[PDB]
RNA sequence: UGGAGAGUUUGAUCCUGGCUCAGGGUGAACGCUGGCGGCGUGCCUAAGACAUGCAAGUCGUGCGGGCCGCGGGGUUUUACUCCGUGGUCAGCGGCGGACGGGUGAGUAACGCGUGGGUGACCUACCCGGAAGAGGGGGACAACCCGGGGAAACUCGGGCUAAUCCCCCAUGUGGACCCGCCCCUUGGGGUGUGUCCAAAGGGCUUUGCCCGCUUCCGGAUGGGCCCGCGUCCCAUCAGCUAGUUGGUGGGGUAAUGGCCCACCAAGGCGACGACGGGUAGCCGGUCUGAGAGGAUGGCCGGCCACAGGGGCACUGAGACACGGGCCCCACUCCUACGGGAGGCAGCAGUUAGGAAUCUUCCGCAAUGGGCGCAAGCCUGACGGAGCGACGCCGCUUGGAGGAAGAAGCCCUUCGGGGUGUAAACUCCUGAACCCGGGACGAAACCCCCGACGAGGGGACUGACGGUACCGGGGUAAUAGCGCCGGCCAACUCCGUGCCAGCAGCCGCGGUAAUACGGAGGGCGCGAGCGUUACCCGGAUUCACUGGGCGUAAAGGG
């Protein structure tokens, strides 16, 4: 009554670029792994199945689309992966992206040739790209009986067994030996497999060069020994729609797809501070992670978790170290492709949902209620790319939008809400155009808030061009509290990035000692509302050189207006120039789309700075205004077909083209 | 899903249906009575009323009426009857009304 | 928990020598013997005149630090003596003295009260038979406070039960150095306790 | 057996006077810390909604069967398959589901509290007393057959039993109308008339046990009625038609406009009617010297409500929380023709909120329903779990040990402080280990007796291998507030009306005991602070215990 070996656990993820088949790939995985019949919706984050004595934990949701972050989190928590590929889309421009981000964490993955039955459906067409675009060492595991329309069956190279499909309803399959012709086409390949697999077992190498065939048991040993090293990428095939290449890709799983054991142990940190391997031991300290919270109308709040060490138990007591809380795990649950399996525990390496717990939000660490109060890794970093200007209509939808991101920032911490620290308006952070757009349906529908959707502002800077000298008097002598503060300065522009430089240039001291302090609060202060549009009149040097006083009428503040009347016109008489913020950037773009990327950067008011090769691409430096920068994530990803990404850092302020100076008078 | 206490409801209906009858009986009967009594049918009234009387106490046995419910009805029947037979009649036959 | 930490420090502050250490406090060094003055950085400076409050708080602490007891218990015991029929001053002391961990100190099975407690705590003590380990336990009139048997022969017990042969024990306690017994004759009286503490002030402390 | 004041209006004074603080309390939350145990206690908000599971049943000693396992087989063989007993399934009938458990929405009211009245009534089961249990008929499920349905179930024939129903008898005796007697609101008698009883089971079978019927009495539990007491607003002053009374009916266990008919104009109100706001009331709880002031959580009593609302049925009792009907709102199934529901029961889910627990173990004990018993049900209860939420007890060590290490701080640089503190030296030994290990449980039952007294015997532990006991046993968790005055406890450095503090007065603008850190100190200690709210201080709404010439206050 063991039932749990660990070496039978398969936690895979179906990640690929849109169109593909991911979803269709899974609703199918779960039909074969369980059609039982014996004489007796992605219903939740992660789901379990049993394929010939192995438990598989799948986390299908990827999508790839602009924003990933979900594809990359599941990936962490789970073992293997299947980058499903559209066999059809041959001149496929986005077959990419996905995989180039998987080894980016370090995880093994096979590839799937999906729509083999759809026009242009060519197997090699992909390997002729799967090694051309990304550069892996795939192994044509099968060959097609009839390309595209003539899709009857398929043949295993490694095992030289022929299979056929009498239909697409998934019923009349069978294994009929190789059909007359073909046959020969095989060999050469079943040797190349028994040749590639030689780079692993030197035992399948010698018997190759002697005249003996490697036993069906060790041959796979080579293939699998190395697949799991991230060296080989077993590519198979089959119309997920017509039920072909599936039940043979399900073997493709177990046989080469890692087990929780086969994978490199988690790192975390103790209360003191130091790394440590979280050993997948069903008897080591309890320490798992929580990723996807959910609201079940039947069991309330669910918290999906992946155990790395120890075992969780039904009717126990955990403790969230992240958010210092004694959560009470009251019941466990395993999501079955068609029902709720109420198990009694989650031994390390396994995953599921714990009914109960409250504070536990995305990626929290829970340890036994006494165990080393440690906190694992998790630390992912998918920041934003596309942001918007959301102004909540009257001061009414600014409260329907306040409780709009107080439940939409816990249910998705992959965005960033921040109030523009210069002009009210709040900025909704996104991971692409699709991210913010759909938050605009629910935050506008499921929250009934109806605010605004225009675009972000620019933090300009008032200033001048020519050095001027105006008077700074005040005097108000009617009889008493006089108010006598007179001054005269030397305001002169400085380089675009100087700041504020005041000069205490008075001879004998015609303006008292006590009164020059509060005369700097008038010049510094008054610089606030510019002489053009009204912005921070910076990048200038003040030089109080003159100005007189009175024995009684003068004040610690009468001199506050005196120096505030000298700055309030020295920038108006010295020709006021409306400067603006220029951001530095870098678009990692394949030099293939580099022609139209650097161009666009010019038809975008900017000037390019360089291109120093990087990897297989090339980075472009430059400066762009911020008015002419909005929605660039869907313009750069445009001139590059997704193969384009960029950064951005502030730099300096610079005058508007005299034509963007008579525009700003709004 | 359910509780076998409906046995109490089923029974309820019955018991209800039963005394619901002897109930209405004593009523109509009680009227047919006071009716004649006032009309003049001296002895042939008493007769009915003497019957009414039975039925009353009769139902008092079960859970229909009880205690004074019976007694009260009586004291009124043979009170309005006797107080209608003096509308010139002399209690002829030996009714319930005592000498 | 029973304070713990620098005591021949309190010995100071209060300025009225304390036997919180027992043996040592007698040698030319109860601390207060060498540096007779409030601890801290300042300590040896012209002390400002005590407020009407300071005085009473100070006298309370004094009395409380003697019996080394938490402010909570001290207060309860106080509040108890108050509602009790009899001159509250004496009565308060009455119970304070009944503390087992104290009757142990008095009967001499211990050098300090700090010690007497640890003894009582570790069941080295007994009451008319069964052993008690609650310092707070309150002795009645006519009880035998002996040392348990497993204890009888333990270095400490002897030495302490040794300096006894000769010395006398309070008029409300009869001790038998041999049988290591001891009766709580009558309830201690006012003078019997030559404490450098004025109760009338402590009383007035809890009057505010 | 009981009463403490202080800070703040002035240049200074006295008075009036407001603000503010020290105390105690809390179903508590928040912050920083957090070791053990015992006993308490834990949705104060949405009386918002709720997935799942369980919270009320039980008698074969009331009756007839269906199904299953035994006897002996009815007959000559299986036949018309009968019988006696032990499992079961539902149906009849019998009690119990009206108690127990939850909640405070409503309610200012005979709701509650208290003291009384019932010549105006009721009370299943339980005690004691009296007399009875005589004949007869009779249906409906169950069951068989047939029909409608998706389902829930439902309809139609035909059987059949009983403590189910019905008629006749006997009526100790009771119920009625009338008369007389005593009495005095309908209370007792008494005569004529009239009307009503009832059931059978088990055994050891002319004698018991459990039942039945009528009547009287007791006990317990109630209904209704009444005097008194029961918050804020007159910037709510007038209210009222079944309204107030009467007569006669109906109605009820019973009084009464509780209802209806018809008469009469009356009933209520500054002793605050009517209206509006708020609230469940009490025993008690907190505070207080007291008088008084708040309050009504847990425990006990009463009430009121079970999604909102109306209504009856059965019954001793309900207008019924896990009963019924209907309206409405919500949840679910649907073959869309119609169906099933009600956590303010236990546990849990979600929403709200600053905030309040396990979908736990046991019927061993107490208590309740049924039963002759055996026994069955029992989220009531007895326990365990989680939370310093509270209170009580306990540990983080004890005795030694320098004219006194180091580090750190202060310094007139002589030195002072931290301080016996550490170190170091012995000694006891929380934790933790092997071993032993309950009280709560002695009845129901069984045997003697007489199934009476009394005597003897047996089965019964969830907590729990827990508490506790003996042996073995390692020096083994401290924070938090404060340090200008009230108010215990000060120095240095940063800082420069900044940053910040702040309960009040106020502190901060280059030497700050007031900000920030440090050393040191004070208080208290598994706690310490903050925030709400109540009493106190506040004789500051003054009955105890104040005032009005100018302080607020005399009415033309
Ligand atoms: C079910 C699944 O696995 O992914 C689904 C579910 C999905 C990942 C969704 C994309 C995106 O909303 C995702 C976000 C982060 C969107 C922002 C928030 O609302 C999150 C709470 C939400 C979590 C999952 C969700 C809602 C999916 C899509 C959407 C595709 C849309 C288009 C127009 C092609 C997908 O997978 O293609
Ligand atoms: N012809 C064909 N179409 C397929 C196959 N598998 C998937 N598809 C189609 O691919 C489209 C997108 O499938 P889906 O898995 O939802 O895309 P994903 O969300 O990017 O994984 C749908 O139209 C599917 O029917 C296949 O094997 N053959
Ligand atoms: Mg998809
Ligand atoms: Zn000393």
């Amino acid at each position: 009554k063991v039932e749990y070996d660990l070496k039978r656990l398969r936690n895979i993820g179906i990640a690929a670029h849109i169109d593909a088949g991911k979803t269709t790939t899974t609703e199918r995985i779960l039909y074969y792994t369980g059609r039982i019949h014996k004489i007796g919706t992605i219903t939740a984050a992660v789901t379990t199945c049993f394929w010939k004595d192995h438990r598989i934990n799948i986390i299908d949701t990827p999508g790839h689309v602009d924003f990933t972050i979900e594809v990359e989190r599941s990936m962490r928590v789970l073992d293997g992966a299947i980058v499903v590929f559209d066999s059809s889309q041959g001149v496929e421009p986005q077959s990419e992206t996905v995989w180039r981000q998987a080894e980016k964490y370090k995880v093994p993955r096979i590839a799937f040739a999906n729509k083999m039955d759809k026009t242009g459906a060519d197997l090699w067409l992909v390997i002729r790209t799967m090694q051309e675009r990304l550069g892996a060492r795939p192994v044509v595991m099968q060959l097609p009986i009839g390309r595209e329309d003539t899709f009857s069956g398929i043949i295993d190279v490694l095992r030289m067994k022929a299979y056929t499909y009498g239909n697409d309803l998934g019923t009349d399959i069978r294994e009929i030996p190789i059909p007359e012709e073909y046959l020969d086409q095989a060999r050469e390949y079943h040797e190349k497999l028994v040749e590639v697999a030689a780079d692993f077992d030197e035992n399948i190498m010698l018997k190759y060069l002697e005249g003996e065939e490697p036993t069906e048991e060790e041959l796979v040993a080579a293939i699998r020994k190395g697949t799991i090293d991230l060296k080989i990428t077993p590519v198979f095939l089959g119309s997920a729609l017509k039920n072909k290449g599936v039940q043979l890709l399900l073997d493709a799983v177990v046989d080469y797809l890692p087990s929780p054991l086969d994978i490199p142990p988690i790192k975390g940190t103790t209360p003191e501070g130091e790394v440590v391997e979280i050993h997948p031991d069903p008897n080591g300290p309890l320490a798992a992670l929580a990723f996807k919270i959910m609201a079940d109308p039947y069991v309330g709040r669910l918290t999906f978790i992946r155990v790395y060490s120890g075992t969780l138990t039904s009717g126990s007591y955990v403790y969230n170290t992240t958010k210092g809380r004694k959560e009470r795990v009251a019941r466990l649950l395993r999501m079955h492709a068609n029902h709720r399996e109420e198990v009694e525990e989650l031994k390390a390496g396994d995953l599921g949902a714990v009914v109960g717990l409250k504070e536990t939000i995305t990626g929290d660490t829970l340890v036994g209620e006494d165990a080393p109060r440690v906190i694992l890794e998790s630390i992912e970093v998918p920041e934003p790319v596309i942001d918007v200007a959301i102004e909540p209509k009257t001061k009414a939808d600014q409260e329907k939008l306040s409780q709009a991101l107080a439940r939409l920032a816990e249910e998705d911490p992959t965005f960033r809400v921040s109030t523009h620290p210069e002009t009210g308006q709040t900025i909704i952070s996104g991971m692409g155009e699709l991210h913010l757009e759909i938050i605009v349906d629910r935050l506008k529908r499921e929250f009934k808030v109806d605010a605004n959707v225009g675009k972000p502002q620019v933090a300009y800077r008032e200033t001048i061009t020519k050095p001027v000298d105006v008077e700074g008097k005040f005097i108000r002598q009617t009889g008493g509290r006089g108010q006598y503060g007179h001054v005269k300065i030397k305001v002169e522009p400085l380089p675009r990035g100087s700041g504020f430089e005041f000069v205490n240039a008075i001879v004998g001291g015609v303006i008292p000692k006590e009164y020059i302090p509060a005369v700097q609060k008038g010049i510094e202060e008054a610089m606030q509302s510019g002489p053009l549009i009204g912005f921070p009149v910076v990048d200038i040097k003040v030089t109080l050189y003159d100005g007189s006083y009175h024995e009684v009428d003068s004040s610690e503040m009468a001199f506050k207006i005196a120096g505030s009347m000298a700055i309030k016109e020295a920038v108006q008489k010295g020709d006021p120039v409306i400067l603006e913020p220029i951001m530095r950037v870098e678009v990692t773009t394949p030099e293939e789309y580099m022609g139209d990327v650097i161009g666009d950067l010019n038809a975008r008011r900017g000037q390019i700075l360089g291109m120093e090769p990087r990897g297989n691409a090339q980075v472009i430096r430059a400066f762009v205004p911020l008015a002419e920068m909005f929605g660039y994530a869907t313009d750069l990803r445009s001139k590059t077909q997704g193969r384009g990404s960029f950064v951005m850092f502030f730099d300096h302020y610079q005058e508007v083209p005299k034509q963007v100076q008579e525009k700003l008078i709004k | 899903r359910n509780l076998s206490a409906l046995k109490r409801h089923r029974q309820s209906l019955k018991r209800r249906l039963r005394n619901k009858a002897k109930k209405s009986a004593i009523k109509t009967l009680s009227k047919k009575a006071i009716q004649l009594a006032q009309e003049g049918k001296a002895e042939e009234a008493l007769k009915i009323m003497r019957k009414a009387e039975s039925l009353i106490d009769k139902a008092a046995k079960g859970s229909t009426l009880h205690k004074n419910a019976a007694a009260r009805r009586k004291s009124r029947l043979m009170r309005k009857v006797r107080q209608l037979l003096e509308a010139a009649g002399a209690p002829l036959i030996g009714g319930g009304l005592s000498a | 928990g029973r304070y713990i930490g620098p005591v021949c420090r309190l010995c100071r502050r209060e300025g009225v020598k304390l036997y919180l250490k027992g043996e040592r406090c007698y040698s030319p060094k109860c601390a207060m013997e060498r540096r007779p003055y409030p601890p801290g950085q300042h300590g040896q400076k012209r002390a400002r005149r005590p407020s009407d409050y300071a005085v009473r708080l100070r006298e309370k602490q004094k009395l409380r630090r003697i019996y080394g007891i938490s402010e909570r218990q001290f207060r309860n015991l106080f509040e108890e003596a108050s509602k009790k029929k009899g001159v509250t001053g004496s009565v308060f002391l009455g119970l304070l003295e009944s503390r087992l961990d104290n009757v142990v100190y008095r009967l001499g099975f211990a050098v300090s009260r700090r010690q007497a407690r640890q003894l009582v705590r570790h069941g080295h003590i007994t009451v008319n038979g069964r052993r008690v380990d609650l310092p707070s336990y309150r002795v009645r009139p006519g009880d035998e406070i002996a040392v348990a048997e497993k204890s009888r022969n333990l270095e400490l017990i002897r030495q302490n039960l040794e300096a006894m042969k000769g010395r006398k024990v309070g008029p409300w306690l009869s001790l038998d150095v041999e049988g290591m017994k001891g009766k709580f004759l009558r309830l201690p009286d006012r003078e019997d306790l030559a404490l450098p503490v004025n109760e009338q002030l402590v009383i007035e402390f809890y009057s505010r």
Side-chain angles (χ1 to χ4, degrees), chain A residues 319-472:
Chain A
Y319 173 61
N320 188 182
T321 52
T322 304
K323 295 168 170 56
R325 181 62 71 82
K326 262 230 306 168
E327 306 291 63
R328 157 80 186 170
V329 50
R331 198 172 314 179
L332 284 308
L333 218 145
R334 274 269 199 57
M335 280 315 297
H336 278 338
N338 194 53
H339 67 295
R340 294 172 172 57
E341 169 180 36
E342 185 184 309
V343 294
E344 198 224 296
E345 57 189 56
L346 274 64
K347 303 187 169 74
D350 208 70
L351 306 66
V354 29
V355 194
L357 280 47
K358 273 56 248 293
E359 317 309 283
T360 304
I361 81 169
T362 172
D364 272 333
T365 313
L366 311 76
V367 303
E369 58 180 350
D370 296 298
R373 310 209 305 190
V374 298
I375 315 167
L376 286 71
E377 178 207 2
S378 271
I379 293 88
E380 310 185 310
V381 193
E383 319 99 315
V385 299
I386 273 298
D387 310 73
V388 180
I390 176 60
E391 294 160 306
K393 214 290 179 176
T394 44
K395 328 300 178 183
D397 307 358
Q398 207 274 172
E399 295 161 277
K400 236 187 181 305
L401 187 62
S402 282
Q403 248 98 61
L405 34 130
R407 176 173 294 166
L408 208 72
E410 289 192 54
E411 184 192 66
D412 188 2
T414 73
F415 70 1
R416 298 178 176 181
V417 212
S418 71
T419 287
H420 191 314
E422 286 300 61
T423 170
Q425 60 176 180
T426 295
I427 310 174
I428 181 179
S429 176
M431 304 186 294
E433 172 240 299
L434 289 167
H435 190 51
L436 304 79
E437 177 187 293
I438 54 74
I439 282 184
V440 169
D441 175 75
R442 287 233 302 141
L443 204 68
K444 160 178 168 296
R445 278 269 270 66
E446 281 57 67
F447 295 100
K448 197 182 68 178
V449 195
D450 280 293
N452 297 296
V453 280
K455 66 174 171 186
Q457 314 299 301
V458 265
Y460 299 128
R461 281 298 136 61
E462 294 282 59
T463 177
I464 61 300
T465 47
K466 55 179 293 189
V468 174
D469 287 69
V470 307
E471 197 188 10

Side-chain angles (χ1 to χ4, degrees), chain A residues 92-333:
Chain A
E92 63 188 21
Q94 258 304 309
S95 54
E96 31 160 293
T97 48
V98 289
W99 158 304
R100 188 184 172 67
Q101 309 135 177
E103 60 196 7
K104 152 189 163 189
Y105 146 76
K106 200 175 196 63
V107 108
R109 83 254 60 183
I110 63 167
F112 195 59
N114 212 170
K115 312 186 192 177
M116 278 296 284
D117 60 5
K118 182 160 293 169
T119 300
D122 199 59
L123 202 179
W124 339 116
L125 227 53
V126 185
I127 313 178
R128 299 172 181 178
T129 197
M130 200 192 132
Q131 72 180 63
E132 192 183 305
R133 307 291 282 181
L134 40 170
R137 190 148 168 178
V139 187
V140 185
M141 295 293 233
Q142 331 169 182
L143 286 73
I145 294 183
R147 297 72 177 199
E148 65 198 51
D149 176 52
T150 27
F151 213 62
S152 58
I154 330 165
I155 268 63
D156 204 339
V157 298
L158 187 61
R159 290 172 181 65
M160 294 299 280
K161 279 193 177 187
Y163 298 94
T164 184
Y165 310 118
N167 56 26
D168 46 303
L169 192 298
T171 45
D172 193 297
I173 51 163
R174 229 63 183 180
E175 57 191 307
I176 57 90
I178 296 63
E180 187 64 359
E181 36 281 348
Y182 282 112
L183 176 60
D184 186 312
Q185 182 182 182
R187 290 308 180 301
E188 50 186 298
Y189 292 113
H190 172 51
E191 331 289 54
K192 292 149 192 168
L193 186 182
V194 180
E195 167 261 353
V196 167
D199 305 285
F200 297 138
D201 290 317
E202 65 296 299
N203 276 60
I204 302 172
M205 163 209 68
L206 282 189
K207 292 188 300 65
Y208 182 60
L209 291 305
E210 297 183 313
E212 168 173 53
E213 63 157 56
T215 197
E216 175 185 56
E217 344 298 358
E218 65 167 346
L219 230 176
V220 182
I223 303 290
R224 179 176 178 53
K225 175 205 172 186
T227 292
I228 313 172
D229 328 0
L230 292 62
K231 316 304 170 55
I232 152 184
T233 313
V235 184
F236 301 73
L237 57 298
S239 162
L241 182 161
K242 302 196 170 316
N243 308 315
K244 308 176 184 179
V246 196
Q247 226 179 69
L248 306 174
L249 173 72
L250 253 167
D251 282 303
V253 189
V254 40
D255 300 61
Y256 315 102
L257 278 296
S259 172
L261 209 49
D262 311 6
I263 289 65
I266 295 270
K267 282 183 169 294
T269 293
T270 66
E272 316 323 316
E274 81 158 298
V275 82
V276 51
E277 276 184 54
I278 310 310
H279 285 177
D281 172 57
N283 306 295
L286 177 58
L289 246 181
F291 54 81
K292 211 284 180 184
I293 322 307
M294 282 191 88
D296 194 68
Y298 297 110
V299 299
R301 191 186 172 81
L302 290 185
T303 352
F304 291 104
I305 52 113
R306 160 57 181 255
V307 205
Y308 297 116
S309 194
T311 298
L312 180 63
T313 329
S314 177
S316 310
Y317 258 107
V318 296
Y319 173 61
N320 188 182
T321 52
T322 304
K323 295 168 170 56
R325 181 62 71 82
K326 262 230 306 168
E327 306 291 63
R328 157 80 186 170
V329 50
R331 198 172 314 179
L332 284 308
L333 218 145

Side-chain angles (χ1 to χ4, degrees), chain A residues 22-24 60-61 63:
Chain A
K22 293 153 289 152
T23 300
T24 336
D60 176 283
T61 303

Side-chain angles (χ1 to χ4, degrees), chain C:
Chain C
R2 23 59 57 72
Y3 176 48
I4 291 174
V7 299
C8 240
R9 175 151 182 294
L10 309 175
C11 248
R12 301 207 231 165
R13 170 53 76 188
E14 235 69 302
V16 193
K17 179 180 186 176
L18 279 93
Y19 304 147
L20 317 182
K21 322 194 85 294
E23 188 284 288
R24 189 203 221 305
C25 267
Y26 278 3
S27 305
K29 37 190 180 178
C30 176
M32 187 112 261
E33 193 72 67
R34 328 187 64 173
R35 353 143 91 308
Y37 56 82
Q41 190 183 70
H42 305 291
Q44 48 192 305
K45 300 171 74 166
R46 176 199 176 192
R48 295 280 40 179
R49 199 265 268 179
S51 76
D52 280 59
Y53 179 67
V55 166
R56 288 89 194 303
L57 172 187
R58 287 272 63 77
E59 189 78 76
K60 196 216 65 182
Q61 299 292 271
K62 197 174 298 181
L63 171 74
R64 179 167 91 72
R65 283 162 167 176
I66 288 179
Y67 292 67
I69 165 182
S70 70
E71 171 68 9
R72 187 52 127 280
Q73 279 184 293
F74 193 69
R75 182 72 174 291
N76 305 307
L77 236 190
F78 183 79
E79 299 303 355
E80 180 169 359
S82 312
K83 314 299 174 286
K84 187 72 175 183
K85 251 306 166 58
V87 185
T88 294
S90 303
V91 184
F92 186 33
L93 297 166
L95 318 321
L96 263 176
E97 201 52 48
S98 289
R99 288 185 65 63
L100 190 72
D101 59 324
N102 172 67
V103 181
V104 158
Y105 171 93
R106 278 287 187 288
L107 233 59
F109 302 8
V111 58
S112 53
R113 283 211 178 64
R114 295 257 273 183
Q115 190 193 81
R117 198 179 177 74
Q118 184 152 70
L119 307 187
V120 176
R121 188 72 208 118
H122 299 304
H124 297 312
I125 288 68
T126 164
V127 178
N128 303 211
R130 298 78 67 188
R131 64 84 180 296
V132 178
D133 58 8
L134 307 334
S136 44
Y137 183 94
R138 253 165 56 185
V139 189
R140 314 182 78 174
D143 291 32
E144 293 185 1
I145 328 310
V147 184
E149 79 290 355
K150 183 200 172 190
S151 307
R152 290 176 175 296
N153 66 313
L154 297 183
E155 294 186 357
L156 205 54
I157 285 290
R158 301 292 178 51
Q159 310 176 58
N160 300 302
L161 247 159
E162 182 52 7
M164 292 310 282
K165 294 207 295 184
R167 267 49 210 74
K168 291 169 58 189
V169 179
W172 67 103
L173 308 176
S174 64
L175 162 60
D176 191 285
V177 191
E178 319 150 59
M180 303 184 222
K181 303 171 185 179
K183 286 185 184 298
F184 192 80
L185 302 180
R186 76 192 207 307
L187 198 57
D189 204 63
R190 184 60 199 69
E191 308 67 19
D192 293 316
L193 289 293
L195 275 59
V197 178
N198 178 318
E199 55 285 302
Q200 288 287 303
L201 276 206
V202 183
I203 294 178
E204 298 185 11
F205 176 61
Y206 287 144
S207 302
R208 194 185 79 116

Side-chain angles (χ1 to χ4, degrees), chain A residues 585-589 591 594 598 608-622:
Chain A
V585 194
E586 293 160 68
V587 271
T588 309
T589 185
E591 25 53 68
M594 176 186 277
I598 306 169
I608 250 63
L609 299 170
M611 64 268 276
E612 313 68 57
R614 293 305 194 57
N616 59 295
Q618 208 155 175
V619 179
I620 305 167
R621 297 126 70 213

